[PDB]
Design a protein around this nucleic acid. Structure first.
Length: 48
RNA sequence: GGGGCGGACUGUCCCCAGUGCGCCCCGGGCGGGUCGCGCCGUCGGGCCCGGGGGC
């Protein structure tokens, strides 16, 4: 009842560090499947 | 399409291969959007701009 006013905590500058994985692009996710197919083919041609 | 810097990720070649991203350097090719200059053409427009036989 004496001092009810609220004071915001001072803001500290961010170092701009990303903590979570970013979204990979179409080129990356297409190269991934291309090389997956290539790897499977090259493994199977030997395993046979 | 290249190089450098930093980094994030993928693949049963993976000691290796491969992809994107932010910055810079790029020698560049492409076209059109804007502006400037030069040249060409107009029985062009400016009462047919201005200078030295017929209406």
């Amino acid at each position: 009842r004496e001092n009810p006013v609220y004071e915001k905590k001072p803001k500290r500058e961010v170092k701009k560090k990303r903590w979570n994985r970013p979204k990979m692009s179409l080129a990356q996710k297409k190269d991934r499947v291309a090389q997956k197919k290539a790897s499977f083919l090259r493994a199977q041609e030997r395993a046979a």
